[PDB]
């Protein structure tokens, strides 16, 4: 994303101003509108599709597989595929490693909810596809993964819990009620914090924050990401506490906005 230095200097002065003047009149905690669609891939246990206001689009597909949880340590696996980016590109590898940590069978997500028998559980394949992106999509991906895991339905078990392989009902199916985490990205422009940073806002930000959220509490991973390379500068510790309090205050509004099914 290219900007003239007259554009950047005007934007930075507006964002770092007291109070922050964002290029769309947004509040430092206000989110841009998004469109969400669920249950459109019948071949998958759950699907979601989110379209950001800037044109960024992301599709998520949830698929299952019975596995022996005594040999399958990780029962949740995320595969990120960003359009127009190598599968070994740094941004893909970083987001893949980051998201796998956000879910990870025993940290953000509830591992016991995937259990079937004393020997077998569900392994969940979360497949992410970013059709278009204009900024760090970790937050957009997280929201799409969240909506997909909620609309996910799995087959109903018949065989006993104590242990042959499990046997499933031919027709009926059970909903997946795992508690999926949310990843928020923030912009550090001067002494101000900005939720849901836009493309041009991130081009002038001094630093950034990636903050995870689950079960109403701040959870890990938490990173200080560089939303650019030109104007990256150190930030005072109080700004880190300010961004975390910002997530803890306004994320519940994001959850009940997404949870509206």
């Amino acid at each position: 994303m290219s900007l003239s230095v007259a554009e950047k200097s005007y934007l930075y002065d507006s964002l770092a101003s007291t109070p922050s003047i964002r290029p769309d009149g947004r509040l430092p905690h206000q989110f841009r509108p998004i469109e969400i669609f669920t249950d459109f891939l019948p071949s998958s246990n759950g699907s979601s599709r989110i379209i950001a206001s800037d044109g960024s689009e992301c599709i998520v597909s949830i698929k299952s597989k019975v596995v022996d949880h005594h040999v399958e340590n990780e029962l949740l696996q995320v595969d990120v595929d960003i359009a127009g980016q190598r599968d070994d590109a740094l941004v893909v590898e970083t987001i893949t490693s980051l998201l796998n940590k956000v879910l990870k069978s025993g940290s953000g997500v509830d591992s016991s909810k995937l259990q079937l028998t004393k020997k077998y559980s569900f392994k969940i394949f979360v497949d992410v596809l970013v059709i278009s992106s204009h900024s760090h999509p970790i937050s957009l991906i997280s929201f799409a993964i969240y909506s997909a895991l909620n609309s996910t339905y799995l087959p109903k078990l018949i065989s006993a819990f104590d242990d042959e392989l499990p046997t499933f009902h031919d027709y009926d199916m059970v909903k997946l009620d795992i508690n999926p985490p949310l990843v928020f990205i923030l912009a550090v422009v001067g002494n101000n914090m900005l939720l849901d940073p836009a493309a041009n806002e991130s081009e002038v930000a001094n630093n950034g924050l990636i903050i995870s959220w689950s079960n109403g509490k701040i959870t890990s991973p938490i990173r200080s990401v560089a939303l650019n390379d030109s104007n990256v500068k150190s930030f005072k510790p109080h700004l880190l506490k300010q961004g975390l309090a910002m997530v803890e205050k306004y994320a519940p509004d994001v959850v009940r906005s997404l949870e509206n099914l």
Binding site: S43, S44, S61, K63, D79, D81, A83, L129
Partner: peptide, 10 residues
Amino acid sequence: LNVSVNITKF
């Protein structure tokens, strides 16, 4: 003219 076909994992 360039064509890129991506067959998703799912």
